[PDB]
Amino acid sequence: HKSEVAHRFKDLGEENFKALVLIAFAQYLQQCPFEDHVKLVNEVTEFAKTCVADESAENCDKSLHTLFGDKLCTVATLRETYGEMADCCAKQEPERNECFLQHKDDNPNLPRLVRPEVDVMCTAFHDNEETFLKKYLYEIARRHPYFYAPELLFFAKRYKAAFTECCQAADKAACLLPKLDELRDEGKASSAKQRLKCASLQKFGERAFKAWAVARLSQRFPKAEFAEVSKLVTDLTKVHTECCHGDLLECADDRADLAKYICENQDSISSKLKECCEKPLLEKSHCIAEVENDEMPADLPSLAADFVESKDVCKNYAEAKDVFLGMFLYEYARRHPDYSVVLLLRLAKTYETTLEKCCAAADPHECYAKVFDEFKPLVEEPQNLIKQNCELFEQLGEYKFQNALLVRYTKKVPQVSTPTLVEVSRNLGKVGSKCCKHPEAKRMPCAEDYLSVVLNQLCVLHEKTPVSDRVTKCCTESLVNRRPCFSALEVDETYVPKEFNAETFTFHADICTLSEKERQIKKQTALVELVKHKPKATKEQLKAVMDDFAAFVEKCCKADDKETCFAEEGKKLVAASQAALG
Numbered sequence: 001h002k003s004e005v006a007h008r009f010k011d012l013g014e015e016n017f018k019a020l021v022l023i024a025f026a027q028y029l030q031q032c033p034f035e036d037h038v039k040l041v042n043e044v045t046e047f048a049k050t051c052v053a054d055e056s057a058e059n060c061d062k063s064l065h066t067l068f069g070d071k072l073c074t075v076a077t078l079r080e081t082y083g084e085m086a087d088c089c090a091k092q093e094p095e096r097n098e099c100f101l102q103h104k105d106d107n108p109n110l111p112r113l114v115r116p117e118v119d120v121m122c123t124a125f126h127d128n129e130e131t132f133l134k135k136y137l138y139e140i141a142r143r144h145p146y147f148y149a150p151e152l153l154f155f156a157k158r159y160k161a162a163f164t165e166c167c168q169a170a171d172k173a174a175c176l177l178p179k180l181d182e183l184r185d186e187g188k189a190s191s192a193k194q195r196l197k198c199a200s201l202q203k204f205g206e207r208a209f210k211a212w213a214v215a216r217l218s219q220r221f222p223k224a225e226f227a228e229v230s231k232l233v234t235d236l237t238k239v240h241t242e243c244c245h246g247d248l249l250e251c252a253d254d255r256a257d258l259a260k261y262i263c264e265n266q267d268s269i270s271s272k273l274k275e276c277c278e279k280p281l282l283e284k285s286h287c288i289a290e291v292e293n294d295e296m297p298a299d300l301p302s303l304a305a306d307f308v309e310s311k312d313v314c315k316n317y318a319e320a321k322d323v324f325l326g327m328f329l330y331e332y333a334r335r336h337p338d339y340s341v342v343l344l345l346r347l348a349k350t351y352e353t354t355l356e357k358c359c360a361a362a363d364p365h366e367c368y369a370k371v372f373d374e375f376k377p378l379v380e381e382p383q384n385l386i387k388q389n390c391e392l393f394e395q396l397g398e399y400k401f402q403n404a405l406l407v408r409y410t411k412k413v414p415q416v417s418t419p420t421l422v423e424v425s426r427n428l429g430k431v432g433s434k435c436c437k438h439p440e441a442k443r444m445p446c447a448e449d450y451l452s453v454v455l456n457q458l459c460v461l462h463e464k465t466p467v468s469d470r471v472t473k474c475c476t477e478s479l480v481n482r483r484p485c486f487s488a489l490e491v492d493e494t495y496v497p498k499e500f501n502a503e504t505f506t507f508h509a510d511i512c513t514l515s516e517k518e519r520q521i522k523k524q525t526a527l528v529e530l531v532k533h534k535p536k537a538t539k540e541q542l543k544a545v546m547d548d549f550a551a552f553v554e555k556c557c558k559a560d561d562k563e564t565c566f567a568e569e570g571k572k573l574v575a576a577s578q579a580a581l582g
């Protein structure tokens, strides 16, 4: 249609269109100041309104890629500030855009964004709510060049609502903070899952992406029939390949359509797409990708009939290896909203391997005869851990639980740095408090969901600077054998304890005056070092120490001369403790 800008502006709205342009520009010209971007947004909006008015007006004729490009090349400090990227401006448009995406530095060396005090934020919020939000929107956008914009926008609306409620509240900091933290993490989690999906689609390729996709889709639209789940899985894939390649336009358009299809054929896909499909252009996608599982038919047969009985198995498995294998997943996926996706792939794999080392031997039906029995333990392992751990997390709290966790993992890989151990042992323990609350039915998917990034997180830090071969083995292992592999790490008996660092176990009183969620990180660092000084330490021996210490803080922090015992009763502990640890 005539004038792309006109159209985009119209069904987007000036308010969003402005936010989006700001973000898109914040994602490329990551170095220019906040004001310089505001100049662009206004300049591009005023233009866009020109087209809305007269579709045949100057340049409206042009495509969105061409316009965005030309204006990007306007920035005068382009070659001085961005150097090389300025060369892109000579290339004709297809190449020009492609050239810009190659230079969208994934990780700029920009400072850690700090959190000003609640009082200043609320005041900046009030005084000028507009530039307050758009200025931070810009702060995030430039630091995460690949974050799908519409999504980043959605996180903004949520940030706004937090102030509207918290700043008007009696106790602001008691309101704002916890809402902000949860909001931060969620956004961090969101960003990590986006790099995952893209890293995988490249390491393991399309096939594995598709398998993971068929499973997850059929687990959500169990009432849809395989032909449909296949159509969706194809398109959904086209989407991710593109949205990873970076181009925001292509991506947004692909995602738009995909949501049209789903809502047009809503009746044959899910009954839960009700709300989402009623939402505006912008949220449909985000919404749809977040919809809850529909409910399965309960009129479903048995995977044993079609996949283990009839002598037409291999006949069918060879007519087209992948489709058949796909159907196995689909079928098994929809009867199991409670299984984690890697678990389902872990089965399909086992089944495939079997039909392989079977349809080539003597009597086929006697070979692939008892597969479902080879599954039992595959389904059992993740389930047992879930319960075994959630059980413990109910006994001790989220904190005491995290401590049981770092004592464990420190013993397994004592070669890891203490900050990293603590970092991990915490996000891990956090998932416990964020999943164990769920009824068993939805526990395994929860864990998988989080755990996935906490592991991808770990596998990157370690990549930057490896320390252990095991951890490197698991990190490079099949993205489906990744969790079992870490689950499989055994205590390290090669390891040789760090020498007694008298300093390491010295405390003053700063701990009686540090934020609780800061007063632990301290304790949780000493523990790691205690376990590293004497790993042969028993669960009882250890606990005996953590008791003499836990008391020592109190019955001494709350003691007139707040620093005598600490360097005083502190010597007794350090001297008594190693006498009880040989």
Ligand SMILES: CCCCCCCCCCCCCC(=O)O
Residues within 6 Å of the ligand: 113, 114, 115, 116, 133, 136, 137, 140, 152, 155, 156, 159, 160, 180, 181, 184, 187
């Ligand atoms: C995702 C869009 C965010 C837009 C700006 C909302 C206000 C953010 C306030 C400051 C917090 C930065 C992150 C942090 O919590 O450390």
Ligand SMILES: CCCCCCCCCCCCCC(=O)O
Residues within 6 Å of the ligand: 008, 017, 020, 021, 024, 064, 067, 068, 150, 249, 251, 252, 253, 254, 255, 256, 281, 282, 283, 284, 285, 286
């Ligand atoms: C240079 C002009 C940039 C104009 C903004 C284009 C972005 C349009 C986004 C459309 C949203 C589709 C919704 C979705 O898939 O979540």
Ligand SMILES: CCCCCCCCCCCCCC(=O)O
Residues within 6 Å of the ligand: 340, 341, 342, 343, 382, 385, 386, 389, 390, 428, 429, 430, 431, 432, 433, 444, 447, 448, 451, 483, 484
């Ligand atoms: C405190 C964290 C508790 C985490 C739950 C225990 C771990 C269960 C295994 C998670 C894996 C789900 C996917 C899979 O089968 O690998």
Ligand SMILES: CCCCCCCCCCCCCC(=O)O
Residues within 6 Å of the ligand: 385, 409, 412, 413, 416, 420, 421, 424, 428, 451, 458, 483, 486, 487, 488
């Ligand atoms: C920095 C080193 C961290 C080492 C700990 C490995 C992470 C394991 C988490 C995933 C598995 C949880 C269940 C299990 O421990 O079997």
Ligand SMILES: CCCCCCCCCCCCCC(=O)O
Residues within 6 Å of the ligand: 403, 505, 523, 524, 526, 527, 530, 533, 545, 546, 549, 550, 573, 574, 577, 578
């Ligand atoms: C060589 C003996 C060193 C003894 C001192 C080690 C102190 C370890 C701190 C334990 C903290 C447990 C956490 C808590 O008390 O909540």
Ligand SMILES: O=C(O)c1ccccc1O
Residues within 6 Å of the ligand: 140, 144, 147, 152, 155, 183, 184, 185, 187, 188, 190, 191
């Ligand atoms: O800190 C945030 O608010 C945030 C939001 C979206 C993506 C990554 C993030 O760190």
Ligand SMILES: O=C(O)c1ccccc1O
Residues within 6 Å of the ligand: 236, 255, 258, 259, 262, 285, 286, 288, 289, 290
């Ligand atoms: O990201 C999407 O657009 C999507 C659409 C339909 C189902 C699952 C999804 O993640």
